[PDB]
Amino acid sequence: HMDIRPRLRIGQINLGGAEDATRELPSIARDLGLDIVLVQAQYSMVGFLAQCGAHPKAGVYIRNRVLPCCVLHHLSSTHITVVHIGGWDLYMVSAYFQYSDPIDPYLHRLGNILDRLRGARVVICADTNAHSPLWHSLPRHYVGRGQEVADRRAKMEDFIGARRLVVHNADGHLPTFSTANGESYVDVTLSTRGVRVSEWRVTNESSSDHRLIVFGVGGGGSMQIFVKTLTGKTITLEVEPSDTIENVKAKIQDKEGIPPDQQRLIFAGKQLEDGRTLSDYNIQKESTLHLVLR
């Protein structure tokens, strides 16, 4: 049974403290196939948010409650929620850098979080309330807007630099933040190096003034192979070069509940023995295997 998607789908949205925007989140997650939504300025009196403190302004929505998800209590606070998505090395951070406050304290805590999780795959979803060309702000957002705007910008970019962080906000997308005073880009999707983020986009799904950002996250450049049936079904699968045929067959079991002892995979006109690896058979990125039932 389980899942048709190969990788996790994530949302990121500042809900502007609105009950209605917070309460539409489950339907939006269902509609778009989101596993996790990293939220800021939630309406906190709801029942479905992992959130910390008395008046939280960051949290995580886990759509499917059976997904093993740990909230790191030692790394979390009202403005920053850290979760572990079990059970290898993927962590995620929802952060809200309140506009009324300096940015330094927030950056120091994020720094602390990154020290502790050194080496791990970490994704950070932050409403920065900062403007930088890194995430497609226009010159009129970060130049000639006063010293504080330039300082937030500078601190944010130094931090990104010092922690070797990757910004996944792509060119040619809608602004993340739309007010009566205009449009801006202040919502930022970061990761540590070697996290694979795909299909990053900004949507119009939420009724917040902020726009829901959506993207994909895998489990490992790890690759993608297409396991095809003769009925037209394609199982997309995240797999390492050195994983075994057996290991692949069990991926299919958990994804489709097909018993491995009744699975036959064929590549390059050759049946695949359980013992061997994806490399031994010269199976690389975007390769297509036949899955035959026996």
Side-chain angles (χ1 to χ4, degrees), residues 1-192 194-195 197-294:
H1 14 280
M2 216 184 72
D3 200 355
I4 60 147
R5 346 159 330 266
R7 58 176 27 233
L8 290 167
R9 307 204 191 168
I10 313 302
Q12 143 176 196
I13 179 63
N14 177 312
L15 295 156
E19 177 155 25
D20 60 351
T22 308
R23 285 194 192 286
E24 66 191 47
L25 251 193
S27 60
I28 295 174
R30 182 190 178 65
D31 171 32
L32 269 60
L34 302 192
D35 306 273
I36 298 151
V37 187
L38 291 82
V39 305
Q40 302 80 44
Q42 63 265 48
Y43 187 80
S44 57
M45 286 302 320
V46 294
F48 51 80
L49 292 177
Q51 54 181 357
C52 302
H55 303 282
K57 306 221 182 180
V60 180
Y61 174 44
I62 316 283
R63 166 61 184 177
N64 179 19
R65 203 179 110 65
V66 296
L67 184 71
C69 172
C70 290
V71 185
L72 315 220
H73 176 271
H74 53 295
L75 298 186
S76 302
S77 53
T78 54
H79 287 251
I80 302 178
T81 319
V82 184
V83 296
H84 186 235
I85 305 298
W88 196 235
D89 66 344
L90 179 50
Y91 301 78
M92 310 193 71
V93 182
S94 181
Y96 174 64
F97 306 167
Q98 202 173 288
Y99 180 55
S100 79
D101 294 343
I103 191 163
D104 305 85
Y106 297 99
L107 295 189
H108 288 292
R109 293 166 194 270
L110 255 202
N112 290 335
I113 293 152
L114 295 164
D115 289 333
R116 174 72 185 162
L117 308 178
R118 187 172 281 112
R121 306 196 276 108
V122 190
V123 176
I124 304 165
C125 290
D127 181 357
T128 71
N129 279 297
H131 308 268
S132 163
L134 272 185
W135 55 85
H136 310 304
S137 311
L138 302 179
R140 71 178 171 272
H141 301 335
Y142 57 87
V143 187
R145 288 288 288 177
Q147 201 57 56
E148 285 175 349
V149 169
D151 290 354
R152 286 187 85 82
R153 169 163 177 241
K155 288 166 193 294
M156 207 54 229
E157 291 168 353
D158 294 340
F159 182 83
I160 285 164
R163 299 298 187 159
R164 291 209 229 82
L165 288 182
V166 182
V167 162
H168 298 274
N169 299 54
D171 189 37
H173 281 274
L174 298 146
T176 79
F177 189 23
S178 196
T179 134
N181 297 14
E183 305 228 85
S184 71
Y185 310 73
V186 298
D187 300 292
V188 186
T189 307
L190 307 161
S191 69
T192 56
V195 183
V197 181
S198 64
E199 263 107 15
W200 188 98
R201 66 201 175 95
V202 179
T203 76
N204 271 305
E205 301 298 335
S206 160
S207 77
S208 181
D209 293 347
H210 285 254
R211 288 198 179 79
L212 167 73
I213 287 176
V214 162
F215 57 93
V217 183
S222 185
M223 58 207 190
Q224 286 209 156
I225 56 172
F226 306 123
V227 187
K228 206 200 161 181
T229 78
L230 296 167
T231 44
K233 187 189 318 160
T234 304
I235 310 143
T236 31
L237 223 54
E238 212 85 280
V239 65
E240 319 235 89
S242 74
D243 286 332
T244 51
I245 307 297
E246 170 190 341
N247 281 148
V248 168
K249 274 173 183 173
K251 290 176 173 74
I252 289 149
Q253 175 183 36
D254 263 84
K255 291 230 154 217
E256 310 289 326
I258 303 169
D261 60 359
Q262 248 142 154
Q263 299 193 19
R264 158 142 38 85
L265 285 163
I266 303 152
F267 184 79
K270 219 279 171 174
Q271 293 177 34
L272 303 171
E273 313 187 338
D274 289 343
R276 297 186 172 280
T277 75
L278 289 190
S279 80
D280 304 339
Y281 283 110
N282 184 37
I283 295 174
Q284 15 203 193
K285 335 130 92 99
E286 303 272 313
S287 271
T288 291
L289 326 192
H290 308 273
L291 158 68
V292 142
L293 287 56
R294 83 201 213 214

